[PDB]
Amino acid sequence: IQFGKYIRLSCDTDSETLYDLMTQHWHLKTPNLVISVTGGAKNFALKPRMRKIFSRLIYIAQSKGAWIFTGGTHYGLMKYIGEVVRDNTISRSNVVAIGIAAWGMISNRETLLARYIMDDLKRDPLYCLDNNHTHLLLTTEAKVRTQLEKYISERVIPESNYGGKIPIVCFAQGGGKETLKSINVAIKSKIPCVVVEGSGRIADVIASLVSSCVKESLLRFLPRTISRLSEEETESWIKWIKEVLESPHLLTVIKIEEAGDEIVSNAISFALYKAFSTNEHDRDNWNGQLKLLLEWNQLDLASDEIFTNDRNWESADLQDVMFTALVKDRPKFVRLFLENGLNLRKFLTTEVLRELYTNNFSSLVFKNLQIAKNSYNDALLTFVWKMVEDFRRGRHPLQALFIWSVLQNKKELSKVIWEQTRGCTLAALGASKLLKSMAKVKNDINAAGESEELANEYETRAVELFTECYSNDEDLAEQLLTYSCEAWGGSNCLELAVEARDQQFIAQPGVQNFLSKQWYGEISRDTKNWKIIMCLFFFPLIGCGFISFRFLYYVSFFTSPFVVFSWNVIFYIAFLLLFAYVLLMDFQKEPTALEIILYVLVFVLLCDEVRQWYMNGSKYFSDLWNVMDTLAIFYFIAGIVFRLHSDESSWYSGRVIFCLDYIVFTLRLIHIFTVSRNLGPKIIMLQRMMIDVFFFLFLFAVWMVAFGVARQGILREWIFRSVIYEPYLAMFFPEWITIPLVCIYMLSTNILLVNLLVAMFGYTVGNNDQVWKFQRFFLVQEYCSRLTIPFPFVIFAYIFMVNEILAWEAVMKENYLVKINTKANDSSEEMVHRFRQLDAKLSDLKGLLKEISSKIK
């Protein structure tokens, strides 16, 4: 059909190959089958509540793969049911909406792509077919429908998730004789369950009953119906409601009090559970009721009615029930199976994990791994992309599952498996490092936008766990920082927080105190600053009772990074005073013995820095001031070979290279003074302003070159020696050209002035205690890594080179996990549980008012 399939049928059709028509020449079979009953009511109060209930129903029908049996006409609900079906195929979350019509009640007919005319819906009582139903089969209709549902309820499937039985549910709302008749043929012919609602005429007369008091409530909800149909038909209606309350287990109500989601999936699953439970051929079966309550998300029904200690499972049979709890993303059920006993390390064999990374790893996330591994590479990503490829080509098993959940952005499933890991403040940072690598991938903003926040949730979990760890024992938490992880990724928690730029983990007072312990070395804090400095100039004051080291005292003093840095600054000044004494009073013609001292004092400055050409990765060359140090030392060695040339034009030029080298050796000392003073909140203002003036001095040099072309082009390989140098030395005819020449200077200034003022203020635009404390931790960490031995005795170390904490961290996790849930009492402060806790207390008053009218009548 074209406004879709069509089949003409009379009522006495065939023997069940109508279903085999639907599955052999046609679409797939069913794990679920909802039917809808509203009749040909042209009026339908389409409330936004009714819009949610019948949009969740189509969403559930594609979440399970169901058919929907409706009258296939273009009126009200069954028109709206079709529109949510085409809304679902457009949104692409398929769903099959099979329409059941009379063939005698339709408007037009075309017999053979057939064309149908949706002309207009006037006063003619014939019905208009609906345009959005995927299949159409054509109160004539209510036997071929009811015999089909009485077939497929008995159709035994070999898959058999719901005792075989192809789960049927009858979704009912609204009034009319036809919807009250169809609930009867639902319950009484065979027994599929029925769901009713809290709005409608016939829907509320059965919702009120969960006698002639039937008819009392019946004229409450539909009084203008009784005035037309007969009293020999009013007697049948009270009779009809009597055969639906004979089976009160096959009825679930959607009460108006449920003002939220879950409510359509709660009602269908509860109705499917009773029709599984009250069958009683299944009450001994705890396992079929588990997979039924796990395919749906009924956590509370599984906790109350399957794990009771009246049923006796023994938790070793719970293996395949756990695997489907993982791959369907049921985070409440993987938590329920560990709470009721499951050794998750025993369950996670290596072929289960390769069953998870092959079949259950999504190809979109695996596509974003290649855009992460090849474009934004790290030491962790090369480990994890290797670890994914080992499983896909077919030992810490709890972290292979944890990486699997974290990669797929499974937000609540990964937090269940994180509480089972052993190194769990390291798995939280290892997830935060991994997710921040996936958040760099700009192939999808929605995937990267949720891996970015899942990284911030796991950074906050590592903060709150380590704050719990540091508050209990400092010396144990600092062993937990530097734990070498047995190849988690081959990193500490401290390394893995600084690659990820995890500023909240690094700015916390436990980590910042660990670095101050590292920088002071074996010298304690609280001594004083000047108390350590005066022990530098005075050796026997160390052995005196003067510092607090918490001989072996002298080696602990002179290997602390505070002392080594203070020595390397004091020796650098004494190097500069010797470099100034040689350059002025000495330096006659030959390399004097005091200058030979300077030749080895820069060689130990050179070997210290090609040592920093290890731990290198060409990170060192993007530091913008550390490249000055090589080019100060390379300019020194170039000034040595000009000294050993015996020409007075070259010897003097060898001195000039040394005198210009004295400034960059002092500019390094000025740079050391300006960073060590502004270590503190100004280190963000510094080094961002310092790259901002390098851009302004670059643009000033570009303008100074262009000023040279305008200068030399106005006047008369010589050009490079005159277009570059003389504009700086000049800062050391009028045709009418001053009409633009001051407008040159009014445009030269206001592009160099603005670039200067951007440099002063550009640090402000674009948390600033955490932004600082990461960088203060960053800079101090490299010097504590920079060979904490005195500088002239660095060569004597350079050429001489040529799990009970995890048990302790596990008990700190349990104290941390309690402190989350006991703080979620302001969430339980609300009237959620508090509302009908006392309506239970007046139902007890109702339960004792049962006793009163029992004997007064």
Ligand X SMILES: FC(F)(F)c1ccccc1-c1cc(C(F)(F)F)c2[nH]c(C3=NOC4(CCCCC4)C3)nc2c1
Ligand Y SMILES: CCCCCCCCCCCCCCCCCC(=O)O[C@H](COC(=O)CCCCCC)COP(=O)(O)OCCN
Q: Give the x-and-dash track for 664-703 against ligand CCCCCCCCCCC (CB under 6 A).
A: ------------------------------------x---
Q: State which H helix or E strand residue 195 sits in.
A: strand 193-197
Would you say 539 or 599 has its CB closer to ligand X? 599
Can you tell me the distance from the alpha carbon of 624 to that of 657, in angstroms, rounded to the nearest whole number? 22
The one of ligand Y01, ligand X, ligand Y, none whose footprint includes residue 702, by CB under 5 to 8 A per kind, is ligand Y
Q: Is 492 exposed, middle or buried (0-12, 13-18, 19+ CB in 10 A)?
A: middle
In the region spanning residues 573 to 602, those forming contacts with ligand Y01, defined by CB under 6 A, are 573
Would you say 5 or 671 has its CB closer to ligand Y? 671
Within 13 Å of residue 233, how many CA atoms lie on the same side as its CB? Answer: 11
Would you say 476 or 541 has its CB closer to ligand Y01? 541
The one of its own copies, ligand CCCCCCCCCCC, ligand Y01, none whose footprint includes residue 830, by CB under 5 to 8 A per kind, is its own copies
Can you tell me the distance from the alpha carbon of 499 to that of 523, in angstroms, rounded to the nearest whole number? 29
What backbone torsions phi and psi does residue 317 show, to the nearest 5 degrees?
Answer: -85, 5
Site for ligand CCCCCCCCCCC contains 446 (CB under 6 A): no
Can you tell me the distance from the alpha carbon of 90 to that of 72, in angstroms, rounded to the nearest whole number? 20
Q: State which H helix or E strand residue 418 sits in.
A: helix 411-418
The one of ligand X, ligand Y01, ligand CCCCCCCCCCC, none whose footprint includes residue 534, by CB under 5 to 8 A per kind, is ligand CCCCCCCCCCC
Q: Shortest distance, CB of residue 530 to ligand Y, whole angstroms? A: 8
User: The tokens of 199 are what?
Assistant: 């709005």
Q: Give the x-and-dash track for 6-35 against ligand X (CB under 6 A).
A: ------------------------------
Can you tell me the distance from the alpha carbon of 205 to that of 177, in angstroms, rounded to the nearest whole number? 13
Site for Na ion contains 753 (CB under 5 A): yes
3-state secondary structure of 170: strand
Instruction: List, in order, residues 6 or more apart from 12 with CB less than 8 Å away.
Output: none
The CA-based dihedral angle spanning residues 743, 747, 749, 750, taken in that order and rounded to the nearest 10 degrees: 130
Q: Give the x-and-dash track for 719-748 against Na ion (CB under 5 A).
A: -----------------------------x
The one of ligand Y01, Na ion, ligand CCCCCCCCCCC, none whose footprint includes residue 519, by CB under 5 to 8 A per kind, is ligand Y01
Q: Shortest distance, CB of residue 773 to ligand X, whole angstroms? A: 14
In the region spanning residues 755 to 814, those forming contacts with ligand X, defined by CB under 6 A, are 779-780, 783
Site for ligand X contains 672 (CB under 6 A): yes
Q: Which of 660, 728, 769, 803 binds its own copies (CB under 8 A)?
A: 660
On whether the CB atoms of residues 519 and 561 are closer than 8 A, the answer is: yes
Length of the chain: 857
On whether the CB atoms of residues 236 and 217 are closer than 8 A, the answer is: no
On whether the CB atoms of residues 180 and 237 are closer than 8 A, the answer is: yes
Instruction: List, in order, residues 6 or more apart from 577 with CB less than 8 Å away.
Output: none
Would you say 256 or 724 has its CB closer to ligand Y? 724
Can you tell me the distance from the alpha carbon of 357 to that of 365, in angstroms, rounded to the nearest whole number? 11
Would you say 85 or 632 has its CB closer to ligand X? 632
Site for its own copies contains 321 (CB under 8 A): no
Would you say 139 or 749 has its CB closer to ligand CCCCCCCCCCC? 749
Binding site for ligand Y (CB under 6 A): 573, 576, 666, 673, 676-677, 679-680, 702, 705-706
The one of its own copies, Na ion, ligand X, none whose footprint includes residue 339, by CB under 5 to 8 A per kind, is its own copies
On whether the CB atoms of residues 715 and 699 are closer than 8 A, the answer is: no
Would you say 47 or 346 has its CB closer to its own copies? 47
Site for ligand CCCCCCCCCCC contains 599 (CB under 6 A): no
Can you tell me the distance from the alpha carbon of 537 to that of 515, in angstroms, rounded to the nearest whole number? 26
The one of Na ion, ligand Y, ligand Y01, none whose footprint includes residue 780, by CB under 5 to 8 A per kind, is ligand Y01
Q: Which of 217, 676, 712, 770 binds ligand X (CB under 6 A)?
A: 676
Q: Shortest distance, CB of residue 788 to ligand Y, whole angstroms? A: 18
Instruction: List, in order, residues 6 or more apart from 438 with CB less than 8 Å away.
Output: 365, 368, 369, 372, 407, 447, 448, 451
Q: Where are the alpha helices (DSSP H) in 500-560?
A: 503-506, 509-520, 530-537, 540-543, 552-557
Q: Which of 299, 570, 686, 697 binds ligand Y01 (CB under 6 A)?
A: 570
Q: Shortest distance, CB of residue 530 to ligand CCCCCCCCCCC, whole angstroms? A: 4
Would you say 44 or 700 has its CB closer to ligand CCCCCCCCCCC? 700
5-7/135-137 β-pairing: parallel
Q: State which H helix or E strand residue 271 sits in.
A: helix 263-277
Tell me which long-range contacts 217-222 makes (C-beta under 8 A, separation of at least 24).
221/175, 222/175
Residues 750-770 as b or e (16 or more Cβ within 10 Å = b): eebeebbeebeeebeeeeeee
Q: What is the DSSP string of 789-822?
A: S-GGGSHHHHHHH--HHHHHHHHHHHHHHHHHHT
In the region spanning residues 758 to 787, those forming contacts with ligand Y01, defined by CB under 6 A, are 776, 780
Listed ranges 85-93, 105-113, 274-282, 283-291: which one lies at the site for its own copies (CB under 8 A): 85-93
User: The tokens of 512 are what?
Assistant: 């910042």
Would you say 222 or 578 has its CB closer to ligand Y? 578
Q: Which of 1, 607, 675, 693 binds ligand X (CB under 6 A)?
A: 675
The one of ligand Y, Na ion, ligand CCCCCCCCCCC, none whose footprint includes residue 576, by CB under 5 to 8 A per kind, is ligand Y
CA 772 to chain centre: 25
On whether the CB atoms of residues 636 and 658 are closer than 8 A, the answer is: yes
Residues 231-258 as b or e (16 or more Cβ within 10 Å = b): eeeeeebeebbeebeebeebbbbbeeee
In the region spanning residues 813 to 842, those forming contacts with its own copies, defined by CB under 8 A, are 813-819, 821-822, 825, 828-831, 834-839, 841-842
Q: Shortest distance, CB of residue 746 to ligand CCCCCCCCCCC, whole angstroms? A: 7
In the region spanning residues 675 to 714, those forming contacts with ligand Y01, defined by CB under 6 A, are 676, 679
Q: Contact positions toward ligand Y01, by CB under 6 A?
A: 519, 529, 533, 562, 565-566, 569-570, 573, 676, 679, 776, 780
Q: Contact positions toward ligand CCCCCCCCCCC, by CB under 6 A?
A: 529-530, 533-534, 537, 700, 745, 749, 753
Q: Contact positions toward Na ion, by CB under 5 A?
A: 748-749, 752-753
Q: Contact positions toward ligand X, by CB under 6 A?
A: 565, 568, 605, 609, 625-626, 629, 632, 668, 672, 675-676, 679, 779-780, 783
